[PDB]
Symmetry: D3
């Protein structure tokens, strides 16, 4: 039991907990609240003894264009009474949320599978990179981490995930110059376990096939084994991620207080 | 330049940045916004080229009784329209503050001296433990970490610092049973670098004396040398503190939602 | 539910799981089997949701004089048919047991409290050093790690526990020269949280007072808090201990295969 | 000098120590005592000053199908008087063996070359992954880690090695679903240093060819230089492997006691 | 700084450009030229206007590494001078190597190398410390001839090579004295772009990379590139340090033994 | 090895005894005498008969650290010689310090120091790397005057001091130029035994420790002491290495700046 999101659904089928991003027109962008909600859901999946896989699915042409800049802008010039300082303001509206959800993903005990139904940006793309298995709809997917372009730094433990998952060098050229991690770089780096090579439009049809396939993949297997394995699997980089989360979230704070991100976030589009 | 805090003051003499907790009439108990302010002050101290020493100082009979209960209570029950869920509330109200001020101390580049003028409790005790050097007023000081008794767990990187600075077994006998790190364990463990042996009422004179001495101690020294050594000293456990900070904050989050802390902060305090 | 030991009892009182070493005449020495049994018990305590503290208590003038050399000797010249090599023999009779029980203590999730009712030696003393809280009966207690004297090396993660709990330097002088960690060095290093200053004979009377005291110490406290704390507390040295366990247990193997320990273990007394 | 193994042979040519799995008529499946023996051989190879390269080689159509089921079954149900409890049994029967042979490989000082003449499964696949260099016979090789399907978890430090050597995501898609690391992922991930493109029947010629080449490759080289570099290369993840080894072994221990592995090793194998 | 006849530098905007400019000798560097690099990197780091440090070279090679004619000069010519062989190589090798190596490891600007040719030995070890590598053509390679030279890993290759090419592929190369060729470099993503430019003109390639970098950096909040690398550094800084220290010291036994010198003499 | 006029050594049974023997100069050591120590430790380590390496000294001091008359010699006397100030101190300071420091950090025998007097600076930093310290009398102390000298931590004090005296007590000392006195040394267990011997005769103290060590080691399986230290080393080896590397390099900015020299000149 948990409050409902107009923008995010969840259902449980068999061993599978399914988070479904359900806001295509708005491009599945996420307000900091929906990010907490995401964290809330993960915790729910994790506490459930029957759940073994947490599948993150989305809708439309994108997975999520990251943070909703409408939600960013309304947390500033609309009401400036509220926080004794910018530092306080951004510790509440940025720092808090970001540590929380990132942590939620890092510590999550069940197999995280992400269905990339389209591109993912910024924090969402950071979360994508935190799932243990990623399948893609077609070959037109990509992850873009626009930090240098927005006057921010790495978030969602990308500091760790990105070079760990794509290579140090590849990560640099990308992050420094605002270039995307294109599909070719994903397959090259075994990031995407399977491409379903399905029509860009049909995210829903794709979302079901992944599920259809999983039911059969798990047939036979001793489920607690997956979990038990993931447990030790986790311990290679748990610490780097926890070390990174804390640090990323606090060093970014400085950029907000300078004010650049806001200047940049205003455009956009 | 920064906002003014009715509860906390700062001033710079030469190379010393001085933070001063100035509300004894309520045990120098800090509210969420106050811990943030503290952090801000530290960032200010850090950014200022002239400063080599950030000295945290208090007032009255206590250093700090820790988080405002009371301010904690106002964050709950008064306005519950506010946050979409219990979790959203405590991320904004507890995680936010704790993770930030803790980091402020962890990363702070200057020699960090706490002046223990009385006992420290909770988050505040935690900040004390994060300082580089501690002098105390008399042998009646102590640090109490009431977590088990508050329905909470470690905060302020105590997960790292307590066992790093008092030994592990002592840490457990203390934390798990809500027994204070009294002065003798503190001196034994070389925690308090000097005890000034001064009467408890005159914390003003104590605060003066420590500054007095500091001006003499720093004489002749190459102050950038202090900073450089600190820089290398810091890496010894910089990563541990970092990892702990992020985890401590998020893990406590599950206690606040259960509600115990609030149920407990309620009682035990009045009458 | 679990097999019974003639040499080790357990009972559960309140939040407290109590392991009681009950073999004084033999000086509570422990055969490798009783070591596994110890591990078995710990796991039992850990799986129990109602248990919050695992208290290890003993009997007589000693806590335990470590490994039973009778049990060591009978695992060699009595029957030498059995193992295709010494290497195999000692991997079964030494390595296996030692990793297991050490691991059992390291990973144990509930507060380990040890009641030192007398001295402890070798592996037992290693286990003592692995508990989170130690109280002593009187001031005539000591831990001796006789490794240099027995032709072995550090076990039970002492490699880690000892210098972590007593100091690098202190540990060296001790371990290198077979000197004990005397009571004075324990209190000096805040190792013993409380001395009950009770008569050396009256271990049973002491064992009860610790319990008597704990009931009152926990009164009030939010128990899951202790646990939750211990959880993060654990993460400072979990890895060093796990790294050490594996290594200690395998590097000791070489000493058995040379055969010195056996030559030495023969005397003794 | 060491005991003779009907199933495993060793010989030294110059600087090469050669281990040879020589029982294809049962898929080079190793029993508990056999894994130990392997380790012994490694220690022998390590102690021998003249040796710079330990080359593990197999026979027939498979490298190794992994642990003897079958030998596993004999350790259960035949004699149950034997061990005081299920836990005592598996510590002696599984923990013992696994923790030892895994360590043998982890710590081994010489350049460790596996010659993949066919697929590797389980503990055996795990040992392959622990070697420094792997050449394969043809593109039909693969490594399968059937843990989820056996009611088990990672072993042989695969917790470290698989994601260290194939990437993490790939590791999960594989491990969690009991899908093999096929040849193309292996070449893609630079796992197999050279593929000899030789027919599957003639593993004898394959084994010869790799040795053939090695004698040429080592020509002119300062062999102690190889050892020294390995020495430094090793520390990159020496500690991770160590930590993993100890944990992997003890954590699996709880599965063997539950009994699933045995229930599963039973089926799926006959007919 | 002083003037080096073999290494020039210029600052164009936010780019601190280092150009190795002694191609006839294959940009081979003496121990002092290495120090000098680290001295330049110090300049680049302290310079609040510089966000990128671009190392560039000349002719048909990036650099064939340590000047072997200089290794000889520090031997056989003057042997008075050092009270022991150990003291000799702590000075001529240990010192230089730790310093230059640390200078790369710790440098806070985006380090971009322009591989205009092959890189060998210590020079190659530096290439593998740069944050981004663009190549001239598919004829480049990195070669770490340590096994052949009676030496061990250097310039943090211990960490950096397995990091960047993978553990197994590193062993095949390091133990057997095989190069990391173009193909393996692209495969492991080492090369971010290949400029398919004629090997003849390295200069033409060099100005083209800078053309593209100026275009790439347009509109970006540059302090972000900085901030990110700060965070990015921490994944491995600790490990590169522990590397650098031992790497330097463990080689000493080899230098002191004599093989590297006997081996260099051919 | 060669012969050093200031440092002798003898092997008595399993003990490799190093004796600093230039008391009139307070056993102050030049950079080369440091190298020499590391050279001796190499001998001790390679010597399969040696299980203990005992460092011993002379007169009223263990050693006042770096020879300040030599720091001057490597300056002002000959300034031709080094193409830059940076190159100068990489050679005269960086090299020497990394080498000697690593030599202690990695040494596989039981390292026992006989504090017959006070130890300062780098010499003190070595004392804190020894595995066991016996003291002559309660008048000894360790002093790390880095704050006073315009320098930073050395010889792994970064790791070793907080390790051995505790983080907080280390700061009071390091920042404010206060010594770790006798009392604090016993308190943190640094000193394993105090031989309450007259400061007059250090020699008498030295032979007494060896008397006691020979008695102590009786009947023990010595290879065990070795094996245990191997394991024991691993708790901190990695950290001491990362220390040593940066420690050496970060000091350079101080040497290159000029303070330490201006400060030494008084
Ligand atoms: C806790 C708070 C966390 C804060 C941390 C902040 C740091 C981050 O996480 S970075 C993430 C921020 N994301 C971005 O900057 C991406 C910005 N968006 C884009 O670069 C573009 O949407 C792009 C180019 C990728 C795709 O655009 P395009 O294919 O042309 O489709 P487009 O027409 O723009 O989108 C369709 C609709 O979705 C809306 N939309 C798309 N993304 C967003 C968004 N992120 N926020 C709000 N609305 C959005 C558009 O406004 C448009 O709506 P409408 O036309 O009705 O006004
Ligand atoms: C970002 C948000 C962080 C939230 C994290 C929460 C976890 C933590 O950090 S733990 C810190 C919480 N602190 C505590 O629980 C300590 C509680 N207080 C005490 O155990 C007692 O003040 C004690 C026994 C130490 C001292 O009391 P005592 O010596 O009898 O003096 P006392 O009469 O109680 O105090 C004097 C006045 O100060 C007030 N006061 C003292 N501490 C506080 C406090 N923490 N909050 C609010 N008021 C306080 C008292 O209410 C009293 O005011 P008044 O009489 O006018 O109503
Ligand atoms: C999984 C397998 C693990 C194997 C790892 C091996 C490495 C280790 O763990 S080291 C631990 C080994 N322990 C030792 O070496 C300690 C040996 N014992 C002693 O040094 C002495 O018992 C000592 C001096 C401490 C105390 O002796 P003391 O105060 O004189 O009492 P003492 O008369 O000897 O003991 C009384 C009785 O208990 C018996 N006893 C005491 N300890 C043991 C023991 N460890 N094993 C068997 N019997 C013992 C004695 O034999 C004696 O019995 P009895 O007189 O009827 O024959
Ligand atoms: C210290 C103890 C460690 C214990 C840790 C346990 C965890 C692990 O290490 S996992 C390793 C276990 N291995 C396995 O589960 C693999 C099981 N085997 C298989 O999935 C199949 O042999 C397979 C499909 C790969 C190949 O089979 P296939 O190509 O059809 O050839 P197949 O006819 O089955 O084999 C030929 C003969 O070899 C035998 N054989 C093959 N593998 C084994 C084996 N692992 N154990 C015993 N016999 C085997 C077969 O029984 C058969 O003998 P026969 O026909 O005379 O009865
Ligand atoms: C601080 C001190 C650090 C010391 C650490 C030492 C460990 C290391 O860093 S290893 C680096 C050492 N480098 C090497 O061993 C590479 C040796 N060189 C070679 O294998 C070859 O130059 C090779 C095959 C790559 C290319 O040769 P090739 O394509 O035939 O061109 P080549 O004719 O040899 O070179 C042209 C000219 O440059 C010179 N040259 C090339 N490299 C060097 C060099 N490294 N040192 C001195 N001169 C060189 C040649 O001598 C030749 O000069 P000339 O004909 O006038 O006498
Ligand atoms: C590889 C190179 C490493 C470089 C790294 C540099 C950083 C470091 O390691 S720090 C170590 C440097 N040491 C110091 O700064 C300590 C300086 N010395 C002192 O503070 C004092 O000797 C002190 C107060 C401790 C003791 O002095 P005191 O008890 O009065 O005896 P004192 O009369 O000074 O000494 C007797 C003689 O020994 C000489 N002496 C003592 N120490 C030194 C020294 N370090 N160097 C040269 N001569 C010395 C004195 O000059 C005097 O000689 P003389 O009277 O014939 O001219």
């Amino acid at each position: 039991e948990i409050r409902q999101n107009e923008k995010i659904s969840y259902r449980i089928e068999g061993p599978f907990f399914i988070i479904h991003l359900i806001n295509p027109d708005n491009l599945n962008a996420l307000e900091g609240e929906d990010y907490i909600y995401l964290g809330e859901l993960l915790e729910l999946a994790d506490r459930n003894r029957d759940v073994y896989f947490t599948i993150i699915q989305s809708s439309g042409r994108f997975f999520s264009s990251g943070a909703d800049f409408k939600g960013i802008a309304k947390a500033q010039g609309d009401d400036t009474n509220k926080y004794p300082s910018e530092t306080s303001k951004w510790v509440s509206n940025f720092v808090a949320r970001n540590v929380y959800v990132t942590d939620a993903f890092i510590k999550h005990s069940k197999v995280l599978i992400c269905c990339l139904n389209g591109p993912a940006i910024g924090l969402s793309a950071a979360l994508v990179a935190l799932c243990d298995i990623v399948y893609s709809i077609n070959d037109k997917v990509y992850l873009l981490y626009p930090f240098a372009n927005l006057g921010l730094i790495t978030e969602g433990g990308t500091t760790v995930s990105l070079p760990l998952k794509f290579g140090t060098n590849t990560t640099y050229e990308c992050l420094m110059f605002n270039k995307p991690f294109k599909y070719d770089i994903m397959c090259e780096n075994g990031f995407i376990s399977k491409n379903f090579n399905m029509p860009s439009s049909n995210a829903e049809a794709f979302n079901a096939k992944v599920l259809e396939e999983l039911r059969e993949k798990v047939k036979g297997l001793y489920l607690p084994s997956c979990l038990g394995m993931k447990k030790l699997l986790k311990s290679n980089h748990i610490d780097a991620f926890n070390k990174a989360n804390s640090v990323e979230v606090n060093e970014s704070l400085k950029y907000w207080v300078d004010g650049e991100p806001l200047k940049r976030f205003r455009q956009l589009g």
